[PDB]
Amino acid sequence: VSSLLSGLANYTNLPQGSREHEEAENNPRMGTFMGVYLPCLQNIFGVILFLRLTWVVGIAGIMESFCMVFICCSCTMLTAISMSAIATNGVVPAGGSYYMISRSLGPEFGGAVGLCFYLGTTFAGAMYILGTIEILLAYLFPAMAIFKAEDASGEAAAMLNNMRVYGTCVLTCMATVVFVGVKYVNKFALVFLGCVILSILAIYAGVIKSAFDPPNFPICLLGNRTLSRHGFDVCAKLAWEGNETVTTRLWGLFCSSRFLNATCDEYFTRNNVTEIQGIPGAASGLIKENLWSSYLTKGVIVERSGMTSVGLADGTPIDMDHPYVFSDMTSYFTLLVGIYFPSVTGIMAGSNRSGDLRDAQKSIPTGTILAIATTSAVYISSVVLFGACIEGVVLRDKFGEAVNGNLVVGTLAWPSPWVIVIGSFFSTCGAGLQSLTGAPRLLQAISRDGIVPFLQVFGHGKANGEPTWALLLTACICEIGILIASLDEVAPILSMFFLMCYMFVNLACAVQTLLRTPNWRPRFRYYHWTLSFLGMSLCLALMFICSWYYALVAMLIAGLIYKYIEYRGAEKEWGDGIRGLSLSAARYALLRLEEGPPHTKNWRPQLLVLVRVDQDQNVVHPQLLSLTSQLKAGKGLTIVGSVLEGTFLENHPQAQRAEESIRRLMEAEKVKGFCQVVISSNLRDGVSHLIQSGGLGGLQHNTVLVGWPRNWRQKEDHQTWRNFIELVRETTAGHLALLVTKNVSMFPGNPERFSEGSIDVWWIVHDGGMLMLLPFLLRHHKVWRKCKMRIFTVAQMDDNSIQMKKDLTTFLYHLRITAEVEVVEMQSNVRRMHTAVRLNEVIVKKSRDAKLVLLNMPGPPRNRNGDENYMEFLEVLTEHLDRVMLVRGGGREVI
Amino acid sequence: VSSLLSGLANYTNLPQGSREHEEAENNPRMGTFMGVYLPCLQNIFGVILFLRLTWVVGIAGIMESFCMVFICCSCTMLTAISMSAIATNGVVPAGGSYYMISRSLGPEFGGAVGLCFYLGTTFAGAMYILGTIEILLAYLFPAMAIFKAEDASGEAAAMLNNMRVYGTCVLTCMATVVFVGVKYVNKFALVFLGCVILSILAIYAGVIKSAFDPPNFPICLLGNRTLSRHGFDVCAKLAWEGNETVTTRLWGLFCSSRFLNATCDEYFTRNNVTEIQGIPGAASGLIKENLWSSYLTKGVIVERSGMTSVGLADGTPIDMDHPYVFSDMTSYFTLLVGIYFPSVTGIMAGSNRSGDLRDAQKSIPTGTILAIATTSAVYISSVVLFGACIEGVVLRDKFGEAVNGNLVVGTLAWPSPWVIVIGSFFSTCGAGLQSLTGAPRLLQAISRDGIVPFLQVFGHGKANGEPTWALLLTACICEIGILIASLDEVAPILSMFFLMCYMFVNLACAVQTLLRTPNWRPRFRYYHWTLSFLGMSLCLALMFICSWYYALVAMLIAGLIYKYIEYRGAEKEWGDGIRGLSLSAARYALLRLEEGPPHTKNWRPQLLVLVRVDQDQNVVHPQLLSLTSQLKAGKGLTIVGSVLEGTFLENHPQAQRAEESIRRLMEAEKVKGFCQVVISSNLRDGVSHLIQSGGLGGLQHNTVLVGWPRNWRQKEDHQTWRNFIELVRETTAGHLALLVTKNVSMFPGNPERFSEGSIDVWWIVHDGGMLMLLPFLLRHHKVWRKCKMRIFTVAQMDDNSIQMKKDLTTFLYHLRITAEVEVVEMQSNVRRMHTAVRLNEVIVKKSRDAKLVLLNMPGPPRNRNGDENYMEFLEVLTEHLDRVMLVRGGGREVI
Ligand SMILES: *[C@@H]1O[C@H](CO)[C@@H](O[C@@H]2O[C@H](CO)[C@@H](O)[C@H](O)[C@H]2NC(C)=O)[C@H](O)[C@H]1NC(C)=O
Ligand SMILES: *[C@@H]1O[C@H](CO)[C@@H](O[C@@H]2O[C@H](CO)[C@@H](O)[C@H](O)[C@H]2NC(C)=O)[C@H](O)[C@H]1NC(C)=O
Ligand SMILES: *[C@@H]1O[C@H](CO)[C@@H](O)[C@H](O)[C@H]1NC(C)=O
Ligand SMILES: *[C@@H]1O[C@H](CO)[C@@H](O)[C@H](O)[C@H]1NC(C)=O
């Protein structure tokens, strides 16, 4: 009991604002029970259980209301799981639910979740304040009212003029008390929870007493219709005062004299007056009867279904139905959902005290889920126990006029009906104070967060971290709810924002799990990404079922703040401008890429090309750029690399020429790529600073496309020829792919197009998925469109049949069967150059005239004295072919 | 006349499909008039002008219909401008409107515009086919029908069973004729346009004749209500056959005997029968009268407004209103808009013949705009001339039963009413043939385009480039329209897709102008980007006014194909996977950046940091990485660069260690950056391959943050010390900014946080916006939060007052006034080291104990013998300060 009372000395249900965020940057105990569960359980129980639940039980029945509760509950339990994965991730920063969402989903969604929830909570201030004024005018003080109806038809207008003149009278009282008396209202958090849960138990007490003996609450009927028990007290058409039968006051309101003359309406005279039991209790058979629907229309008299009546009097000449019971408004299914829904909102109060718990990764998930479960078990068992204990004709009655102006709920209370009427009053007064505290701290947090700059003046707090300007704005948005002055119309507008916040909380947690954003570790047990997606579609549907023409103005206001933060998100970090909106998406996509493996399933060539630029700078071989567009036509990353010699301190105007000749040239041949002009000491280094440092992030170059040294055996170019030899060993170590083009100047540019073409591919042993795919990418292009693919295979085994039967089943698996297959078969440098000249005879004698020849490029020797052991081997390999492309690679897979 | 008839030998209104796209890749005259204008003018005039316009004129009046036409017209004229900017851009490829949109907006939107337009046109096939069957059962052959009403109440059911049994009977006839007889229906394009425009002129002929003498079309009334003139011929209650007055057949349908006994309904007997003129003409005063609204309800008898009647008989005991004129359906404003809208669709037929025009950048814009203008001028002047010439009670009449079963339009025809009835029949038959040709060529184009892979089997054309499988699918989507069997319900579903296509065509052209996508040159005269945006919101609103619960199923089907193409767009080019969806957005954002200038308005430091990694590799100074997070905290690009020595062929396992030590370290201090580990010959080169080649695209590094050589005067490190000196001259030439950190090991890491801190800034002459902003970024961080900013200025002039009054007005402009200001003032190497030791005395004697000191770093000498002329100058400058950061930069501006 000791940790109870000491914890009850701590227990306050208020959010932790930015003053509690200051104590987190400068650097007690709680529990699961008084920390999350009891704050959340208070902020869900509200006015709708007491003031408008029984009105929904009788109208929609119990079979449609059970389906109605189970779809409004099931959104909250799924968006608690999306509040759970935010809790398990992160370190749960001290201060509010705003800082828990904003830090774990970035400032992108946090300014939009935090701002829908500001307006959604401010209308919960004005809705509860209309809840208190309605109780004050119907049950507590139904005498005191300024505006009174000047006729029998002014009940529509004078009632709404009551709700405007007391709301604005009390909203100024509510705003000042939370302003000056913050320390007092901090103390009464246990009073308000005591008033609620006793009032809920007082219902469940009296439902058990009514099973054994129901109370005395009779109702009076007149044919099928009932009548207001306001003016008269006794229900009889004739008062039998002994030997003198007297006209009652029931006679007086209908018949236009209190005399025995019988000069009145024919519907009163032909129909008798019946007084039966209005609350027959749990022993009664109501559940088989009161089950389906009673969807009335505004003006229709509420009529008991199963009574014998007399069918006449088509008009309604009863002094505007002076003594009867009516329907206030027309009603249907998808209107009540806007009224029921704010009874299930308050999950975000589950983490008002995250900076005081000790196990915040376990209290915040398990606490709200248990709080939703104990609340939905009340709601569902309230709906049935309202149905099977109370006659439906008073359940269709707002304001309890059929039971002589007492609360429809409060007549089911065992001690007294003044218990719930007072008990729901200090409840709804208290959740009005809480809503004028939880909302001004929130706008205080967003304003000091700097996340949206035009809301900057609302950060001006007072001396103790309490606001002064957000109160005056939240007093003027509660003000708009009070001018509407109608509990049934504030409720769908209020519901439209709390649906919108739970729309985003399910949205961002489903996206960031799928795309694998950085720093996203939902370490929760019972979680998936579809489970946030399923709740995302569900409270998309509820948002239109309320009112579709308000759901579009709710999205496109929230969808425009989400884009307004990003346009200010760019202009702070990325310098300025609409360029920064593209810089950030460039950065954020690259940081996404850092997790996955490179080799995953599939291979595509991503070209690194490197050109030679001479003196009076320009490219020497534009046909090499012309090849690049013929493979990777309007596709992945292209890096046009180039080098030149020495002293960047005075060589950069040459770099300006060198880059600009390439930029206008890629546009000339439709290459969408990126230029790198590097100034090195020798060309040996400057090529190797691009084979390993081209393309940051995941967008690495994957192949290297290079020409051929044509000035091979000449004066000094040997070391430039030696730079080619170090390039081959480099790509094997770095695990790239090499593409070597021979006779570069005679290549098909984009004017020349070929016809009757044949490409001849010689796939001997190695490089399967790259030597096969390279013509298939080329043929795909319009220049190489009208061409033929020929694949010739060298063999070294004995059988060729199964060798072809192994080869012919590759194409069926590759789905590119259109190539024709033909089999062929037959100190250290000479053995290399024995088979060189022999095979090159076999190459030409079946492929003298192709438009392009493909060959395997073998591995260079590790000796490094193999300049002449290996390169005459390749010039014999290029035995006077017109266009041959050499290829080798390492460590890849092609599907 | 010669180019007419020869052009009339060419004039065919069919789209150019993929066979016309083959003739563009292998590689006559037209004009504006027969090329764009007349094809577009045919495919807008349809069934709605003849069959359901007059029904809308009488119901919605002429004041609401004029506002109705002017908002459905104004969407088409704005989406023609968005079709104009697609035309002026590009080269206008041969073949259809699909290839014009797909190439100019990429395969992203082209598969979604091209697929909404496929379904939007297929229902235009089934709508027109219901238009022909309705004319065939009401005017031409109203005798032949299989299903006939078994009672007076079967007219609802038997009519819809007529439309199902003839539609599917004729849809098989429509599908085969376009299959086998493509050459025949190619010839009749001039017949169908001749049938339309003569029928439109036959209306405007007879409206002029009716002004001088209206024809004879009388109608019969009975009190306020009219009656069907079907069975009887003469309108009198008593046939006066001489001396024997006889009961008419008008008597026979009402009164239940053709005898003179008068045994019948009291509404017939108390009310007289009036036969007035049903079409009073242009001379009549109808326009002041027939103006407002007549929104009826299903079952209500159409009643003339201004007639004297007799008010009795509450029920309708007239053998289910056997002889009367009714309303087929309930109606309101936002239901008729779904019926009127397909009268204005057909813009995409403006470029069916783009591959045959000569000036395709001028014919396509000016042709469709003139085609919309001449069509809207018909529609608006048809609405008024229908109102002010025809009595409203037959305008509320479908099927023309009040005028004895003749067309409400066709009675305004001057030669004969059989002109329009035949003329609108060969029109609507012809636009049904055209819709079963324009739609199967379209799905043939998307299937061969490979843009969506599950639609691949629909590319199987026949031998002459004509489809065979897209016809059977478009016969089965017309089939669903025929089972609905109702012209009033196919029309909003048909309207929902053509609105969706014009939604995207306005969308993509407004986006790609704003973001400046590559290759987007709208060279059109009268164009802006808001003018596409204004039309985008307008046919967003029309899409909900039709039916909101169909607009959400129209977007989220089109919005899901747009994301399905991209997930196949990634898995083709970027290897595979959901990584490729991020690679493409990374590439596409960088290619956007290539246009704009760098220096635009604002400056932010984008750090290039470079570290020293020793033997048994690890970073030597982790405190330098600790500084990076304290400036650019969770913000722009960070490049952690590193070098090591020699022979990448065998040095890459050292590179694996070198990169991995940095990756776990940036996470340890919350740095979101990118690693580059470069292996060079000397460290002189390998630093300079990062100062100019770090960060492709727009995301360049903008500053360089570097430590300090502490082993200054020692054994061999002179040349490594000389590598620092070449780094300073390099950044001045490359126009970067330099940040030099002194005493690197004693820096505040993220555990240690400071209090009572002072940062002392010495801004002497140069580097304004960088030396001011650098503490302001630091203070912003939590470690440097509780600190003070002190700015001390060295002076060389005489006055200091106005010098402070120039300095104190900077802070008011910078809004960072919180710093305190204090003024101070007072072979070749010695003059540099005279003022060095003098100023460094002045530095320390006001700033002995700051947490960080900022100083201007001067320019190095061009002599290059200034190793000792300049670096003792800096070590005297660092006169035993704890933490000082040196800074200089070039060519920037800070706002
Ligand atoms: C209550 O009684 C009346 C007659 O006493 C029932 O009959 C209906 O009366 C209205 C007149 O307001 C008529 O329009 C309906 O056609 C009557 N319905 C019939 C004859 O079936 C009325 O239904 C009763 N109310 C109930 C059962 O809820
Ligand atoms: C046509 O005549 C009738 C009476 O002959 C007009 O009067 C209405 O009659 C209906 C009965 O179906 C009543 O429900 C309405 O209350 C009557 N309206 C009155 C009396 O104003 C009827 O308005 C006439 N139709 C017109 C003018 O369009
Ligand atoms: C109505 O009844 C009263 C009896 O209370 C009588 O005084 C009065 O005269 C009667 N009025 C008549 C019969 O008009
Ligand atoms: C009302 O009920 C009583 C039974 O006490 C009966 O005598 C009377 O006739 C009824 N009146 C009616 C049906 O109008």
Ligand SMILES: *[C@@H]1O[C@H](CO)[C@@H](O)[C@H](O)[C@H]1NC(C)=O
């Ligand atoms: C109705 O009038 C006819 C005259 O055509 C007459 O033959 C018949 O007897 C009459 N029926 C009566 C009066 O019931």
Ligand SMILES: *[C@@H]1O[C@H](CO)[C@@H](O)[C@H](O)[C@H]1NC(C)=O
């Ligand atoms: C119908 O009009 C005629 C005028 O020819 C008149 O004699 C007759 O009384 C009218 N009938 C009515 C108003 O029922």
